[PDB]
Amino acid sequence: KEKHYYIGIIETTWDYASDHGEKKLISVDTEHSNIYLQNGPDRIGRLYKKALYLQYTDETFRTTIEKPVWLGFLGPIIKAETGDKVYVHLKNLASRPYTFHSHGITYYKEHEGAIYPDNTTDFQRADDKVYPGEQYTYMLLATEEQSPGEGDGNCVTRIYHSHIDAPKDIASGLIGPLIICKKDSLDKEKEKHIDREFVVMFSVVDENFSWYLEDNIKTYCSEPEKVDKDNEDFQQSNRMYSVNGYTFGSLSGLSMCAEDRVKWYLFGMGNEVDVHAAFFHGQALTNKNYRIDTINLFPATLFDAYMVAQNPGEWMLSCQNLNHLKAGLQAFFQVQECNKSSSKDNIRGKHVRHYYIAAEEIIWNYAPSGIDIFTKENLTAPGSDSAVFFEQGTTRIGGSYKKLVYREYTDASFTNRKERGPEEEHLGILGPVIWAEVGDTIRVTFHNKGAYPLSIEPIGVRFNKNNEGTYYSPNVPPSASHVAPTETFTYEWTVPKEVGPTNADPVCLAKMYYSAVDPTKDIFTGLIGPMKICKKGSLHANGRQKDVDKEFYLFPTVFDENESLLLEDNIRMFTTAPDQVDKEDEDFQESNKMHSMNGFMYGNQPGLTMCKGDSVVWYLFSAGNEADVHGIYFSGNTYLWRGERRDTANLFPQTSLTLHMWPDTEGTFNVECLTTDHYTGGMKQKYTVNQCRRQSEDSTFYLGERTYYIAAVEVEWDYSPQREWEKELHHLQEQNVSNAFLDKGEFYIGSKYKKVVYRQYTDSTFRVPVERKAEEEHLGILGPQLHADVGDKVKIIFKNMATRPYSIHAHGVQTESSTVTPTLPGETLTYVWKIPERSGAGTEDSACIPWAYYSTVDQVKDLYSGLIGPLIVCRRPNPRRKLEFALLFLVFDENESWYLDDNIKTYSDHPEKVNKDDEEFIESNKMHAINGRMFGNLQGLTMHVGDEVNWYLMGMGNEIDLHTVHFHGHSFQYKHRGVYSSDVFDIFPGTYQTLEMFPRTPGIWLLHCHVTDHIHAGMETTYTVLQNE
Ligand SMILES: *C1O[C@H](CO)[C@@H](O)[C@H](O)[C@H]1NC(C)=O
Ligand SMILES: *[C@@H]1O[C@H](CO)[C@@H](O)[C@H](O)[C@H]1NC(C)=O
Ligand SMILES: [Ca+2]
Ligand SMILES: [Cu+2]
Ligand SMILES: [Cu+2]
Ligand SMILES: [Cu+2]
Ligand SMILES: [Cu+2]
Ligand SMILES: [Cu+2]
Ligand SMILES: [Cu+2]
Ligand SMILES: [Cu+2]
Ligand code: NA
Ligand code: NA
Ligand code: NA
Ligand SMILES: [O]
Secondary structure, eight states, rough: OOOEEEEEEEEEEEOOOOHHHHHOOOOBOOSSTHHHHOOOSSSOEEEEEOOOEEESSSSSSSSSSOOOGGTTTTTOOEEEEEOOOEEEEHHHHHHHHOOOOOOOSSSOOOGOOOOSSSOOGGTTTTOOOOOOOEEEEEEOOOOOOOOTTTTSSSSEEEEEBBBSHHHHHHHHHHEEEEEOOOTTBBSSSSSSTOOOOOOOOEEEEEGSSSTTHHHHHHHHHHHHOOTTOOOOOHHHEEEEEEETTETOOOOOOOOEEETEEEEEEEOOOTTTTEEEEEEEEOOOOOEEEEEESSSEBTTEEEEEEEEOOOOOOOEEEEESHHHHHTTTOOOEEEEOOOOOOOOOOOOOSSSEEEEEEEEEEEEEEEEETTTTTOOBTTOOTTTOOHHHHHHHBBBBSSSSSEEEEEESSTTTTTTSOOHHHHHHHTTTOOOOEEEETTTTEEEEEEEEEESOOOOOOOEEBOOGGGGGGOOBBBOOOOOOOOOTTTEEEEEEEEEGGGGSSSSSSEEEEEEEEEOOOOOOOOOOOTTTTEEEEEEEOOOTTTOBTTTTTTTEEEEEEEEEEGSSSTTHHHHHHOOGGGOOOTTTTTTHHHHHEEEETTTTTTTTOOOOEEEETTTTTEEEEEOOSOOOEEEETTTOOOOOEETTEEEEEEEEOOEEEEEEEESSSOHHHHHHHHHOHHHHHTOOOEEEEOSSSOOOOOOOOEEEEEEEEEEEEEEEEEEEEEHHHHHHHHHHHHHHOOOTHHHTTTTTOOEEEEEEEEEEEETOOSBOOOOOOGGGGGHHHSSSOEEEETTEEEEEEEOOOOSSSSSOOOSSBBBSSSOOOBBTTTTTEEEEEEEOOGGGGTSSSSSEEEEEEEETTTTHHHHHHTEEEEEEEEEOOOOOEEEEEEEEEEEGGGGGEEEHHHHHHOSSOOOOOOOOOOOHHHHEEEEEEEEETTTOOOOEEEEEOOEEEEEEEEEOTTOOOOEEEEESOOOOEEETTOOEESEEEEEOOEEEEEEEOOOOOOOEEEEEEEEEEHHHHTTEEEEEOOOOO
16 A cells, blocks of 8 residues: 655644533642633733644645544544555645654655754755745655564554654644554554544643744733743743643543443653653553553653443543642543443452441651661761651651551441551551452442541442542532541442453452542542452452462552641641741752652561562552652562563552562562662662571582673763764754753863773783773773673672772672672672573563663662663574664763762862752753763664664663653564564663664664653764665
8 A cells, every 4th residue: 555645734723721611620629720721911821823733635735634633733643554655745834844753664864854963965854854835755664674563453653743853843733643553454544343543642742842932922921021931830831731732621522432442542742741640540451461551651652552441431531640630631531322232241249348448547657767777877867868858846847747548447337457467567558458359349338537538549440430439520428539527438349350350461460549539639648558459269268369478569659748638737746836837948848758668768668578489479559740750679589570570660650560579599688769869768678588498508500600800990981072963963953052961161060070880801900901892882881791691600700990889789680698798999809690590581571681780889879970781691502693782871960979079170160169059050960871972972883784683771860760762763672572562662760671673774863762851961872774785
């Protein structure tokens, strides 16, 4: 099929909230919509000039093909099937230059529609700047390499947008869907055996970034002269939390029949605030044949889900990022009776699990011992990081808060409790486990003994409209939505086969419950609890899983006590001077942000104990906002998840995960969040693995032995040795051109910083560094790429050539002991890393998987000072050339380096003028690099057509280190045998991933994180595909 589309870019008004009316939303209180939507002398309002893609019939762009009402401002849906040749005839009827750049489809440099320094000449540059009145025809081929995977649906979510300044072009409104499908998937532009196809973009559409910001300020503001574009409140008012451009519940036309087979194409778009949690209330979806209910989306995350629509009524599609929810990121959809036909389960009443739970106020100490169990230091030590959170005095609450927690009782009398045992000691602030099997019916008698109205809203089970735990709509006594301060309601949930684990899932799936009267306050108050939905006949009568020694529930979150219903109470109860407290003081707000695991902090979480050999299942879930970017690292052990070997689990708002671990080493290890602020703020705990069998004289399998000589060495590191690529890009872009990170100006540091980094040496004398070859030029700041095979004992001979104590240690790897010995300056130590089966690929991994190696002495500062490398572990005992590249996506926060003072003194032209606490100086030191290089300074990513390339992506860092790695020109495949495919991979702290690529098309191709703030900050480079012979 040759397909021909005619897309034109017109400027036009967009209404973000096309009333009409009139609504009640979750957690938005009537008189709040108008922060974003109300026209004032100072405020644009709900109407904006935007550049939009429209579809036309004709090379004579005159009569438009109307687009679905639910698309909103997204451009027209383009589709293609493996084999197809799509011709996108673009015509610019707007006032400035734009392009059409497509994801997930093959093009030559003439048809990429993206401008950047690629050493192309004019023939291959017409695509990259289509001027007003110009017209360009993009030839896109749907190659085999870009097609959906074996393990994928028939169709996957892709996107197109303009790419001169992509972030700005997209904010201005030039973004749209491409659905790519397998060969004979489609009949008349619709998937065979699918009834409805919707496309949904979650984005905080930031009109501050639009090309038309100024035009819009003139048009809509009565006092333009009075508008400060840098006023924070002005900026917020132009942030349109929307799905498809529709804000506050106004998305129109999402309608379907019960039993319709619905395929949803979702994607996220935007910036660091775009931590999305897409959640279809009342319904049940699969993704890659797995049961899911929340779909997390980030800038350019591409995601597809299947839904058999059921449980008829009016439901919400919401973002469960609590900030997004309360900023109104909500859309209604309709499941109607028509009349069906089928039904299938049935079971609503037969086998009944009955729970008696009460909300009641306790005084929760986040750290009972008063000590940091990790350091033995105590938490109020003046000047300590913990002090910020545990200091108690004039205007500071400290470490104990009144909270409203769920607690279990034996029966409807609520006269006596179901006490907690050993198995339940780790739950802390969590409520009681609710568990159920496919076929059960859950009835929950909820009795509120708190001063505020609460509810229970479960994720993971089916319930009907008058059992729903939250209230929303498009139009005395107690109900599912409202259970007031002394009342009592009894919920009824069902768990049919349609809502439980699937064949691919494990036996049980981590889920959760919370109070959703106002979930943006209720959860943080304490009303969160763990839940466990399992397959038929999988649990024993007592709830425990068959052949499972231990079951743990971890809930990591920044418990934001500023948002608790009980804030005022806690101020009045714990501060010396309640009247002197400003709830809006940032330092006051920080003091209330309790970074915790199950409400415990700084290693105070008890009850995480097990035997070596035990079968352990970890149920993890989280809630919160954009700050809740978690990487939960089990030091000393790995786990399987969907057949993947990993040791760090990423959680976002309303994420749930089920990990299986079999601990193989006696000791006391760490479960900790690697997200550097969370770690520092006390999101860290211990778990003990005890020796419960006779030791046995063992270690009788070493298929291999390796020694590496590595040194920590202090060096001048330049993030941007040259600035030509940058200067060229901004010229092409017509931009200008303060660089906050590289421009020294009056007194800033610039691009060069003293750092400490890992380097390989030839032998134990450490006199002679291993020469970095052409194929390892790309490593950049990274230490050497260490290789190991499953079965190896790897000796690391480590010399600390730097001026303070450091260590070397690896993820995934097994060692003799839970402790890692620091090695002092001048000293050489030996570390032994064993590589058992569980340090290598799972059933469903690629043959080679990466692990980060790093320094344990101070994990935050040692990392930002520059100590970080890749260990690659491989399975097993004519074809193509096989290449390897390792990529760290990390904002090197040079403010946290040990060498900061050294650097201020060495590079600043006026050291005295530097204030370390000044925001502007802090930004100047946040180096948004790939492998320690910015703006195209990462060299040596070269390959030939026909090669197989393993890309080892590695992410570390802080809350803002969510990186959405995108490759121009080619997509990749992932997982055993290449069964999922994409061209954007999401990387967070702790995420290490192999992606296989089979490059076809010659060129120099852009490779960049797709987060607005990171692209502009320079987190990008190019890679080169060369033709043959
Ligand atoms: C630790 O020392 C602090 C220092 O001010 C002291 O006041 C406190 O009692 C100690 N903490 C505990 C509970 O051990
Ligand atoms: C672009 O061309 C310059 C000058 O000929 C050359 O030195 C450089 O290798 C090229 N850049 C890339 C990314 O290949
Ligand atoms: Ca081009
Ligand atoms: Cu893109
Ligand atoms: Cu969101
Ligand atoms: Cu975290
Ligand atoms: Cu990024
Ligand atoms: Cu792209
Ligand atoms: Cu791009
Ligand atoms: Cu940034
Ligand atoms: Na606005
Ligand atoms: Na506090
Ligand atoms: Na800098
Ligand atoms: O792309």
